[PDB]
């Protein structure tokens, strides 16, 4: 199947002085493998998976230097953005940043990403061709012009189509035992008689990996969405994920309803009936 490497950065300023918070997390697919958090007093990029822990001291020294450079970058950016938006030092503001690369089943490059948000909304994003930028407002247009003149996208494209995919492939090989295996959902259905007139059917999916899954209800083979509820996929805490989807049905009409599960770890889509 397909794979990704992604880094997520959050920078949160604090009123007046006071250092901003900075947190950096790196993932392969849905597995966290590195972290650095200023709120946890980090001093190094820290491993969080055994396949990365085996990398040697030069690797970790280098990642620690780069994550400290990203932290300083964001410290500048918070000040810069206050200037662009004419904002006081007293308020708290947030910069978010994500970047990384996708590869396919043959592990060849699929897509790259590099994008920013300010205070919870888009700011600037590298378009899909990795040659131009989408700017959300006029402040971001200043960034766009600066980065066009400096040929930033060309530099980032070299990392995105090259270094990223090259290190992703290495990670996927060293972590072949864990990263390259899937855990199919364990599914079951529960019936709770709500009244004499209705009953809730709840279709459960447990201990699956990756997190991507679809749970859908059908009534007599057609898609049914009214009287349904669908919770967000949630982490179990052991690396797997959980999800459920529920539908309220007329008592006596339970057999009209089927729950459908699609997941990369399953040989075929699942159909579950209350019976």
């Amino acid at each position: 199947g397909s794979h990704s490497m992604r880094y997520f950065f959050t920078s949160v300023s604090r009123p007046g002085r006071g250092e901003p918070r900075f947190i950096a997390v790196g993932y392969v697919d849905d597995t966290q493998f590195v972290r650095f958090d200023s709120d946890a007093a980090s001093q190094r990029m820290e491993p969080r998976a055994p396949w990365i822990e085996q990398e040697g001291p030069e690797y970790w020294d280098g990642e620690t230097r780069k994550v400290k450079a990203h932290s300083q970058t964001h410290r500048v950016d918070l000040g810069t953005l206050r200037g662009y938006y004419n904002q006081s030092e007293a308020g708290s503001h947030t910069v978010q940043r994500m970047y990384g690369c996708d590869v396919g089943s043959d592990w060849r490059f699929l897509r790259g990403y590099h994008q920013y948000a300010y205070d919870g909304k888009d700011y600037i994003a590298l378009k899909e061709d990795l040659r131009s930028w989408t700017a959300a407002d006029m402040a971001a247009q200043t960034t766009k012009h600066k980065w066009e003149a400096a040929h930033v996208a060309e530099q980032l494209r070299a990392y995105l189509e090259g270094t990223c995919v090259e290190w992703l492939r290495r990670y996927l090989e060293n972590g072949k035992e864990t990263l390259q295996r899937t855990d199919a959902p364990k599914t079951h259905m529960t019936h709770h008689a709500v009244s004499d007139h209705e009953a809730t059917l709840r279709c459960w999916a447990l201990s699956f990996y990756p997190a991507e899954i679809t749970l859908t209800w059908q009534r007599d083979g057609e898609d049914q969405t009214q009287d349904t509820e669908l919770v967000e996929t949630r982490p179990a805490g052991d690396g797997t994920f959980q999800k459920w989807a529920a539908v309220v049905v007329p008592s006596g009409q339970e057999q009209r309803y089927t729950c459908h599960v699609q997941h990369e770890g399953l040989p075929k889509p699942l159909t579950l009936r209350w019976e």
Partner: peptide, 9 residues
Amino acid sequence: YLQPRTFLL
């Protein structure tokens, strides 16, 4: 593997 270059907004 983090990006080795810095670009400021």
